[PDB]
Amino acid sequence: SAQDFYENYEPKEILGRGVSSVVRRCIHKPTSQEYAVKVIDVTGGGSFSPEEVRELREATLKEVDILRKVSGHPNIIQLKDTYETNTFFFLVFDLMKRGELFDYLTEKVTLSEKETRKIMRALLEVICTLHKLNIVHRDLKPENILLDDNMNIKLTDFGFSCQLEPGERLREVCGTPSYLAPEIIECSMNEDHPGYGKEVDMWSTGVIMYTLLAGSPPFWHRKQMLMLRMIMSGNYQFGSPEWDDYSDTVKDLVSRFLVVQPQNRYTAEEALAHPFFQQYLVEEVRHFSPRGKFKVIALTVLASVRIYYQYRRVKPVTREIVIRDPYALRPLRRLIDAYAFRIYGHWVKKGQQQNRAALFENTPKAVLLSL
Amino acid sequence: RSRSNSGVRLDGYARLVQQTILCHQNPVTGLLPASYDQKDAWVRDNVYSILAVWGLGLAYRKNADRDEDKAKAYELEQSVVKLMRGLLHCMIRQVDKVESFKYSQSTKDSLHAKYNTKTCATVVGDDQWGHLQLDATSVYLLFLAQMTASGLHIIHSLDEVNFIQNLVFYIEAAYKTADFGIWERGDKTNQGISELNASSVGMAKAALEALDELDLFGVKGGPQSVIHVLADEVQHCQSILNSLLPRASTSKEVDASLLSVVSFPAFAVEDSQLVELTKQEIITKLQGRYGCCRFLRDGYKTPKEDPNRLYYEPAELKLFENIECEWPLFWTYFILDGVFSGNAEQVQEYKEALEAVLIKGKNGVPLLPELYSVPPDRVDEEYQNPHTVDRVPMGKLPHMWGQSLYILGSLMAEGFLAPGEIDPLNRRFSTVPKPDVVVQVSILAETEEIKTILKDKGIYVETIAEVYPIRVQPARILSHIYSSLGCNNRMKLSGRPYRHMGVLGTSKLYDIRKTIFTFTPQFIDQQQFYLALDNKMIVEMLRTDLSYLCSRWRMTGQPTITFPISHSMLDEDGTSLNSSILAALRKMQDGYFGGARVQTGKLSEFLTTSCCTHLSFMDPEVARYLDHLLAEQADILYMLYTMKGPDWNTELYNLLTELYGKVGEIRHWGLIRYISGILRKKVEALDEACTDLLSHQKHLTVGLPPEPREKTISAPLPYEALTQLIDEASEGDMSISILTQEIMVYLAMYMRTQPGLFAEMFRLRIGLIIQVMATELAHSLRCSAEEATEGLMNLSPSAMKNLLHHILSGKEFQGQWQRRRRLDGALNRVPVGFYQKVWKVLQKCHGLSVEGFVLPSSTTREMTPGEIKFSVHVESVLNRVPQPEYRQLLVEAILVLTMLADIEIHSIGSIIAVEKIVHIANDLFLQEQKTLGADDTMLAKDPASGICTLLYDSAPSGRFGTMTYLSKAAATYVQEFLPHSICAMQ
Numbered sequence A: 001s002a003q004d005f006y007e008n009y010e011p012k013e014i015l016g017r018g019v020s021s022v023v024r025r026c027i028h029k030p031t032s033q034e035y036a037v038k039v040i041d042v043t044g045g046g047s048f049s050p051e052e053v054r055e056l057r058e059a060t061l062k063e064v065d066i067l068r069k070v071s072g073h074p075n076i077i078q079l080k081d082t083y084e085t086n087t088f089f090f091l092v093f094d095l096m097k098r099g100e101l102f103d104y105l106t107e108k109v110t111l112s113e114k115e116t117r118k119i120m121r122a123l124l125e126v127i128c129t130l131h132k133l134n135i136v137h138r139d140l141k142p143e144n145i146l147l148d149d150n151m152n153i154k155l156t157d158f159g160f161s162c163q164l165e166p167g168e169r170l171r172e173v174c175g176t177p178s179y180l181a182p183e184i185i186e187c188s189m190n191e192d193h194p195g196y197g198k199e200v201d202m203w204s205t206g207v208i209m210y211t212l213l214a215g216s217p218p219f220w221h222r223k224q225m226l227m228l229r230m231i232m233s234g235n236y237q238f239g240s241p242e243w244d245d246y247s248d249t250v251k252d253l254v255s256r257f258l259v260v261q262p263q264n265r266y267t268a269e270e271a272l273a274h275p276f277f278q279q280y281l282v283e284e285v286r287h288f289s290p291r292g293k294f295k296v297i298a299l300t301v302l303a304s305v306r307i308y309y310q311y312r313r314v315k316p317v318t319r320e321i322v323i324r325d326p327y328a329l330r331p332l333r334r335l336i337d338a339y340a341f342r343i344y345g346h347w348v349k350k351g352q353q354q355n356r357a358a359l360f361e362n363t364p365k366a367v368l369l370s371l
Numbered sequence B: 001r002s003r004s005n006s007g008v009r010l011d012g013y014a015r016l017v018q019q020t021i022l023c024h025q026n027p028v029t030g031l032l033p034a035s036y037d038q039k040d041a042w043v044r045d046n047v048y049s050i051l052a053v054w055g056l057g058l059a060y061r062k063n064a065d066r067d068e069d070k071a072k073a074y075e076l077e078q079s080v081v082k083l084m085r086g087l088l089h090c091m092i093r094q095v096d097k098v099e100s101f102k103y104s105q106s107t108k109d110s111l112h113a114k115y116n117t118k119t120c121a122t123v124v125g126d127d128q129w130g131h132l133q134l135d136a137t138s139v140y141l142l143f144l145a146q147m148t149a150s151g152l153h154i155i156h157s158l159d160e161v162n163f164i165q166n167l168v169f170y171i172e173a174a175y176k177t178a179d180f181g182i183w184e185r186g187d188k189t190n191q192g193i194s195e196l197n198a199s200s201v202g203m204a205k206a207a208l209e210a211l212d213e214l215d216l217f218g219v220k221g222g223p224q225s226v227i228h229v230l231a232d233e234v235q236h237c238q239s240i241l242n243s244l245l246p247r248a249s250t251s252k253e254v255d256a257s258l259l260s261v262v263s264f265p266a267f268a269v270e271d272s273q274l275v276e277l278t279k280q281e282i283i284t285k286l287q288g289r290y291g292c293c294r295f296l297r298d299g300y301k302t303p304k305e306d307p308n309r310l311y312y313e314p315a316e317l318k319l320f321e322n323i324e325c326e327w328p329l330f331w332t333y334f335i336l337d338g339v340f341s342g343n344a345e346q347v348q349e350y351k352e353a354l355e356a357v358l359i360k361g362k363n364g365v366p367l368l369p370e371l372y373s374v375p376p377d378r379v380d381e382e383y384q385n386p387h388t389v390d391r392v393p394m395g396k397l398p399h400m401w402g403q404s405l406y407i408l409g410s411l412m413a414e415g416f417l418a419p420g421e422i423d424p425l426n427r428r429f430s431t432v433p434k435p436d437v438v439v440q441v442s443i444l445a446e447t448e449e450i451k452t453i454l455k456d457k458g459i460y461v462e463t464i465a466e467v468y469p470i471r472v473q474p475a476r477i478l479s480h481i482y483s484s485l486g487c488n489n490r491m492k493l494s495g496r497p498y499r500h501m502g503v504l505g506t507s508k509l510y511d512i513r514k515t516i517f518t519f520t521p522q523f524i525d526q527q528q529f530y531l532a533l534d535n536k537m538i539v540e541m542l543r544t545d546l547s548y549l550c551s552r553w554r555m556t557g558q559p560t561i562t563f564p565i566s567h568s569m570l571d572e573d574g575t576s577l578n579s580s581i582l583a584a585l586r587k588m589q590d591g592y593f594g595g596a597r598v599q600t601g602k603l604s605e606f607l608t609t610s611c612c613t614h615l616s617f618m619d620p621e622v623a624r625y626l627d628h629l630l631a632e633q634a635d636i637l638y639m640l641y642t643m644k645g646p647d648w649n650t651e652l653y654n655l656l657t658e659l660y661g662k663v664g665e666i667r668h669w670g671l672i673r674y675i676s677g678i679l680r681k682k683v684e685a686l687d688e689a690c691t692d693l694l695s696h697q698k699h700l701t702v703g704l705p706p707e708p709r710e711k712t713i714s715a716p717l718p719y720e721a722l723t724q725l726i727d728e729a730s731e732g733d734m735s736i737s738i739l740t741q742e743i744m745v746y747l748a749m750y751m752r753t754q755p756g757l758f759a760e761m762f763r764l765r766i767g768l769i770i771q772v773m774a775t776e777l778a779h780s781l782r783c784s785a786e787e788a789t790e791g792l793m794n795l796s797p798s799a800m801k802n803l804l805h806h807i808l809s810g811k812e813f814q815g816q817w818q819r820r821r822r823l824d825g826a827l828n829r830v831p832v833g834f835y836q837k838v839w840k841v842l843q844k845c846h847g848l849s850v851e852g853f854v855l856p857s858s859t860t861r862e863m864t865p866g867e868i869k870f871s872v873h874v875e876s877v878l879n880r881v882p883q884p885e886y887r888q889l890l891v892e893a894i895l896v897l898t899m900l901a902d903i904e905i906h907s908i909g910s911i912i913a914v915e916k917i918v919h920i921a922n923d924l925f926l927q928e929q930k931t932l933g934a935d936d937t938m939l940a941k942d943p944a945s946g947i948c949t950l951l952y953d954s955a956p957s958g959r960f961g962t963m964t965y966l967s968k969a970a971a972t973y974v975q976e977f978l979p980h981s982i983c984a985m986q
C-alpha cells in the first residue's frame, strides 16, 4: 500500500522521466540513505487499456522477479523492495547521482580506451552472471546503463528480460532497433529460424564498444528498415579518419561480438579472456624458455624504442594541417566532436531519429544521395 | 543586594549605545538622522539602528528587579517604541501612497525612504529620490511583528492595525515588483532602473511570515488586531528567492545585503545549501581585509567617481573594478549569523576582523566606519593586486545602521541576549527540514447525475448540496472577500487588491460568519480562460498544484483541495468520465498523485484536520453577496460577432460568453481561443508567470521578431502594464495575444518543473515561439503556413503544451539538420557558457563583425563575461542575420574560433567577420563535394543566405561535417589577418 511506501521512504525530487515510468529520489527514513524510486503509472493517464494495464503489471511482476533472482552483485542495482498499488507500482533501488551512459556519452563524445575497459569489464562480468543464471536481457542500450560517482556501471531496465527454459530460444521482438542482433530481425522476417538464445546480449554489448569509442552506433541510418539490412548482413567499418588511432587489440574484440552468425559469437566467459581485459597481477612467476627470456628483453627494448618512435611521429598542430584536413588528426577531431555535442547535445535522445550518428557526417553527400 | 555583573557590563553597553545612537534620537519624533551631514532619517537605517537599543532593553529587562534597571530598560524599550511609532507616523502620513501602491506597484506611489527627523514629514519629493525600497518597509514590518512579540506595544489603534494590514499588501507584491532596494540605486548601473533584488523579495517574505496571524496588540488583543497574511505571496517570494540565489538580481552576481536575507534578520531562505552557497559566494567575491563590498562594481564612494553626478554612465562601471569601497557593516551580519547558527568560530573570525576596522573616537568608544575607501594614489595598485592596499575610513562615522548590529552582535555574543529574544517569532529555524504534508482531497460532483457516473467507476463523492452546511465557492469569491481586509474609510484604505489565489490560499478551510467555507482551486475556473476547458490540462495543472502544495505548506492542519467534477470534465458523449480525469481520480484514492500524499475523503471528514482560518473582517458588495449566499454554424457566428464592429461591450442587441459556452462543450480550440481574444479573456497569473521566468536570469520578449514591435521584459512588470504591453505588442491580432500569454503559462510551467530546457536560451522570445512552433506543426502534416496558423489555434492546451515541450526539449517528431538548425537558430539556443566564451575570444581580438555590425573588444571591459547585458550585446549582433538557420551557422562558427583561439598562442589583433567564415566554408564545402561526385542539383544555393542547402543539412561533426569545414575556414581568414601563427597545446 501507499502507506507502506511513505512509512519507509519520502520522495524529494524528480530525477528522470519515461514513457509511463518516473524515477524519483527518496530518503529512507530509518536509515537516511539515498535511494532511487521508479514510479510507473499503471493506468498511464487513461491511455492504457485494461489489457495494457494488466500487461504492464505482469511485465512489472516479472520485472521484480529477475531483479529478485540477481542480488548482491556489484554492477546491477538492488531492488530493495517493491510496492504495488491499484494505480502505481513503486520500485525502490540504489541512487545513481550521475545519469545514464547516454548522457555521459553526450558529454564526452569519444570515450577513452582506459575508461571503456572497466566500464565493459563490469558489463561483460554483468553478462556472465546473467548467462550463468540463464537470463537474457535483449535490452543492453547505454540508456539502460547507469553510472555512479565512481563511474561504476549499474545495468538498469531488465524490463525486456526473460528467463529461457534450458535450451529454448525466443521469438518476440523486444528492443529499440539499433541494438538488435542480426537474428532478432531474421526471426522477425522468417519462421524457420527457431529463435535466439542467450548469445543475443553479446551483440548488444559489442555495439556499445563502437558507440563508446567512436560516438556513433555501428549501423545507423535515418529510415527504419535500412538499418536492419546493415545489421543482418553485418556491414561495419572502422572508418577513417576516426577509427585509425585506436590500438589494434580494440578492433578484433569488436568484430568478435559483431559476427552475424550467433554460434561463432564471443561468449561472455571467453570475452573477458581477450587480451584487452587482461590485468597485470604483480605476483606472477612467469617462467620462460631461454628464447622466452630473449624475447622479453628484446621486447622490453622494442617497447622503449617504440615509445620514442611513436611520439616523435605525432605532428604538432600547425596552420596548414588545420586548413587541409582537421578531422584527420586526433587532437582537432576530438575537439570538433566535443564542441559538436555542446551545441547540439540536446538533439541526441533515445530512439532512431535522435541517435548520436546524426551528429556525424562521415560520407560525401553524393554517396549519401546515391539512392 | 548589589547589581549583577551583567547589569554592570550593560552600563558600558548603555554608554556605547547612548553615546553613539540614542543621543541622536529626535526628541519629538524619536527618529535617528543618518549623520550630521545627512540630517534625515531613513526608514531602513532607523529600524536597523534601533536594534541595539531593542537588544539592550531586552538585556536590561532580564534583571528588572530594581527601580533604576527597570527604568533604563523602560527607556530603551520605549525609545524603540518611540522610533517605531515615529516611523509609523512617517508612513501613516503617506497613506495615499500606500493605497496607490497596492493597486499600481509604481515607484511614483511608494513610501518615501527618507523623512524629516524633526517633523515626520517628507523631506524630498516622489521623484527627487529613489523611494521604492520594499526592504525598508519590510525591515519595519518584520521588526514591528518581532518587537510586538517581544512585548513592545507599538501599534496603538485599530486604524493603525488597518494601516499595517494595508502595508502587508504594500509589500506582498515584492516578488513581482522591481525596486531600488537596500542601496537606493536600483540596478548595478545606478541609472534609475528599478530591479528585482533578492533583498527586497527576501525581506518581504520574512516580514509577511512575521506578521502572519500576529496580534499587534500583544496578548491583550483580539481578532480585530490580528494581521492576516496569505501564504500565496509568502511562498511566491520563495520561488523568486530560490531562482535568484545565490545572485541578488539579474544585474548583480552577489550582494552582501543577501546576508540580511539568508541569515539575519530575514531568515528568508529555507534551503541550507542555498544559505551556505550564497554566504560563501559573498566570501569569495566581496570580503577583503576591510569588510565586504556591497556588490561588485559598486563605486559608491570610490575615488574614481564624481560625487556631483547622481547617476553613473555605463563606461564608468569598469573604473570601479577591484577598488570598490568596503563596508564593515556586512561583517556584523556574519557575526550575527554565527550567533544564530551557533558557530563560535564564525563569531570569532569576524569579531577580531571587525575590531581592527572599528575607529576609536570620543572617550574610547568603538565607532563602525560606514566604508573603507582606496586612497586616490593607490587605486592602480589594487587594480593589479586585489584586496591588499591600505584603505582609509570614509563615509558616515559612525554608521548608525552597522553600529547597532555590532552592539547587537556584541550583546548576543557575550551572553546578554539570546537569539530567541531578538527573534521571538522563531525565524532562525527556517532552515530546519520540513516534512511534506498530506494533501486532503474531497472530490465533489456538481450534480447528482455526475455522482452516479463517478459511482459507476467506483468513486466515493458527495454532491455539492450534500456538503451543506459546508458550502463551496470559486477561488474568485475568496479573492473578493479579502478585498474587505484592512478597509478604513476615514484613512481611505480599500483593503487588499484583487489578486489570484493559489492552492495555498484555497486549500484552507475558511470560517466566515460561523459558516465553514472551502473554495475551489483557481485552475478549474472556466470563466476566466480556456485552460480549465481542457480536461487533460486539469490533471496536469492539478499534478503540479498538489506538488506545489505538499512541498510548500506551512500552516496548521492539512491542506484540503475540494475538487468538483463538472460536466465539462465528462466525455463528449456525456455518460462517461474523461479518461485523463478518470485516471486522475483513482490516482488520488490510492494515496499518491503528482508526488504528493493524497488522503481522499469527504469534506466533512476534513473539518477537524484542516487550516480553519477565521475571517474576522467578515464578522459584523461581497458581504451583500455573502449575506444572500449564507441565507447558423458556429464558425460563421464569429464573422457575425466580429463584424458587429469592434467589441462594443454594450447592448447593441437585435454576451459571447454564451457563445463561448457551446464551444467549451464542443471543445474546438481554434474557435474558443478566438472568442477569448475578442472578449479579451486574460489569465490571472501571468505576472507571476512572467516573474518566474524573469527570476531565472532570463529576458522575456513577447512579439514578432522585429525589434520596435517586439518588447523585452527585464524587470517585473505589474499586472495591468504587462498585459497592456502584450496587447500592444499583439499589433491588433487577437489570436497571437492569447497565444502569447498562453505560452507564457507553459514556459513558466516547464521552468518551475524542468529548469533544464532554458539553460541554452537566455532570452525567452515568446513571439517567435509561436512562429517556431508553427513551422514544426507545418512540416508535420505537411501544409501551408496559413493552414498551420489555423492549425496552431486548433490544438488542445495539453497538446499545445506538449508541442512547445516538443520544441524546447529537443525531441523530433527541407532536411533533418535544416529542421534542426531552423529550430536552433530561431530560438537563439546557444550552448552553456557561449556568452562566457565570447568574452575570452574578444580579448584576443579587436571585435567580432556580423554582416558588418561590429561587437568590439571594448565591450569585454564594459560588462563582465557573466553580465546579462553582455549577453544582449552578443545576441544583438547575432540577430543581424534574419534567416534562422544561418544564425546557428554563425553560432558554431563563433565557437570554432574559441577552440582555435585556445590552440593559437598569438592574437589576431584585428576584426573577424564571423559571417565570412561560413561563406568560404560554404565555398570549401562546395569544392570537396564537386571533387567527390556531387552534382549541381544536390548542391543548390539557399536563395537568401548564400549557403548550400546541403551544408545546412550536413551533420555538425565528421569528416565532412559543418564544423569541420568551419574549423577549416576559421583558419584561412586568420591567414590574411595573421601572417604568422603559432599553435600549441594541440
Ligand SMILES: C/C=C(\C)CC/C=C(\C)CCC=C(C)C
Pocket (backbone or CB within 6 Å): A317, A318, A319, A322, B841, B844, B845, B897, B898, B900, B901, B902, B903, B904, B906, B907, B908, B970, B971, B973, B974, B975, B978, B981, B982, B983, B984
Ligand atoms: C591554431 C589555429 C590555427 C589555424 C587557426 C587560426 C586561429 C586564429 C586565426 C584567430 C582566431 C582567434 C584568435 C582568438 C585569437
